[PDB]
Design a protein around this ligand. Structure first.
Ligand SMILES: [Ca+2]
Ligand SMILES: [Ca+2]
Ligand SMILES: [Ca+2]
Ligand SMILES: [Ca+2]
Ligand SMILES: [Ca+2]
Ligand SMILES: [Ca+2]
Ligand SMILES: [Ca+2]
Ligand SMILES: [Ca+2]
Ligand SMILES: [Cl-]
Ligand SMILES: [Cl-]
Ligand SMILES: [Cl-]
Ligand SMILES: [Zn+2]
Ligand SMILES: [Zn+2]
Ligand SMILES: [Zn+2]
Lengths: 173, 173, 173
C-alpha cells in the first residue's frame, strides 16, 4: 500500500504478502507470509504493534489500531471482513471477523470463531473456541457447525489465491 | 478514482459517471450513466461482476464486493450510504442503503426500499418492495410512507447533481 | 491529506492540524488548532460546512458529511472513532463518538458524552450532557462515571500528542 515508518519503526512485510497501494500501513506492523491488505484498509502501528499472522487477510476499508498496553495480535487464516475494525485485541487462528463488526481492547477471540456482521465484541471479552458471536454487546449464541468450521479456513485460502492474482495481474489505467 | 484492470477485465465506466480519484475501482465493474463513486469507496470486481445502474451513487468509505456465484447488481436511483457494505447482493431500483449498513450474499432487495442505518440484511434474505428494514438481523418493520417513497428517488437525484458539481468544480490544492 | 476546493470553497486548516495525506478533505471544511484527520478519513464539505473544533480528532476510515440545512459542527476535545460516520449533526465538547457508530442529521450531542461502538443516534435525537448512549436506535442508558468523564478529555489529549508525532516523524517508504 502506501507504506510508512514512524520514528524508529518500519513495517516488517513478508515478500509474499500483498499490500494494495491504496491501503495504509504505518510503523510497527508485521505482515507474515501470504497475508493480504486490501484497498483503503488502514493498519496504524503508532502506539503498540499490530501483528498479522500467516494466511490472514485484512479487507477493504478495515481499520486496525491499538491502545497503550494493548497491541493487536492476529493469528493465522484470519479473515478480517470489509469495513470491520479491530482495536487492541487478540485474535486466534481460523477466525472470521464479520463485515463491519468491531473488536474492542483487551478482547481475546479464540480459534475457529465467527463474529457476525455488525457485531461488537466488548473490551476484555473472552470468546471461547468454536463460537458464533452475534449482537451488541456480542454474545456467544452457539457453537459452530462442521461446515462453518471448514469455512473458517476456506475463506482465508480463497484470499491467499486472490492476493496472488492481484500481485501478478493488477494494472492501473 | 484510482482505476484498475485485473487480468482480462477493465471497468466499463460511462463518460458521465463521476469516480473520485480517491475511490478504488478494480476489474469487472460496470458504472452506468450519471452514477457516482465517492472518496475512499471501493468496488472490487475481482471475483464476480459489480454492476451499478443509472443514477446510482456509492458513497464515501463504502465497500462493494462479491462471492463466487454471487455477483453484486445494483439498480437505478440507488443510494449506497456512507460506510455501508454490499456483498454479493441484488439491489433493486430506488433503494436507500443506510449509512454503515450491511447487505449480505444472496440477499434480494426489492424496489422502493429503505434499509436503516446500521442494519444488516442476512444472506439470502428477500426484502419486498416498499419495505423499511431495521435491525440485526434486518426485519421489515413496516411499509414506506409516501414521503419516504418520494425520497427514495430524490436522494439519488441530489447526488446526480452533486456528481456534476464535482466533475466541473473540484480542484486539488 | 489530499485536500480539495470545490467551486468557491477552500478548506480552512490551522497550521498545527495534522491531515494525513491519505485523508480526503473537500470544500467547506474548518479544522482548528491541534485537530487531526487520520488515514482514509473523508470530510466532504460540498453541501453545508463541516466544522471541527480545537483538540478534536477524526479517525481512520471515518466519513463526515452533511445534508441541505444541516451542517456538521464538532466541538472541542471530540474523538470521532475509527469507521464512525457523522452526518449533519451537532456534537458538543468532550464527546467520544464510538467506533463504527453513526450520528444522523439534526442530532444534538451534549457535552461529556460517550456514544458506544456501533450505536446509531437517530435524526434529530438530542443527547443530554454526561450521557452514555448505546443501541440502535441509540438510547441514553445511564450517566457517565467520573472515570469516563476524565476519559472524554484524555482520549483527545492522547491524539493531540499522536498528531504531533506523525507531523514530525512520518516517512513514506
Ligand atoms: Ca518464515
Ligand atoms: Ca477508506
Ligand atoms: Ca465502516
Ligand atoms: Ca504461487
Ligand atoms: Ca445508454
Ligand atoms: Ca449537465
Ligand atoms: Ca486561534
Ligand atoms: Ca509541540
Ligand atoms: Cl458470551
Ligand atoms: Cl422480514
Ligand atoms: Cl434516550
Ligand atoms: Zn484507536
Ligand atoms: Zn468479500
Ligand atoms: Zn451524505
Amino acid at each position: 500500500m502506501a507504506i510508512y515508518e514512524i520514528n524508529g519503526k518500519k513495517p516488517r512485510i513478508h515478500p509474499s504478502a500483498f499490500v494494495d497501494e491504496n491501503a495504509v500501513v504505518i510503523g510497527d506492523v508485521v505482515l507474515e507470509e501470504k497475508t493480504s491488505v486490501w484497498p483503503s484498509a488502514v493498519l496504524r502501528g503508532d502506539i503498540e504493534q499490530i501483528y498479522v499472522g500467516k494466511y490472514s487477510n485484512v479487507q477493504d476499508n478495515v481499520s486496525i489500531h491499538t491502545s497503550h498496553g494493548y497491541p493487536t495480535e492476529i493469528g493465522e487464516y484470519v479473515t478480517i471482513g470489509h469495513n470491520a475494525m479491530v482495536h487492541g485485541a487478540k485474535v486466534g487462528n481460523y477466525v472470521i471477523i464479520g463485515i463491519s463488526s468491531v473488536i474492542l481492547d483487551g478482547a481475546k477471540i479464540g480459534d475457529h470463531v465467527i463474529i457476525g456482521a455488525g457485531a461488537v465484541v466488548p473490551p476484555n471479552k473472552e470468546i471461547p473456541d468454536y463460537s458464533l458471536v452475534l449482537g451488541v454487546p456480542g454474545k456467544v449464541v452457539r457453537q459452530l457447525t462442521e461446515e462453518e468450521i471448514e469455512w473458517t479456513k476456506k475463506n482465508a485460502e480463497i484470499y491467499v489465491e486472490l492476493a496472488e492474482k492481484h500481485i501478478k495481474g493488477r494494472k492501473r489505467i
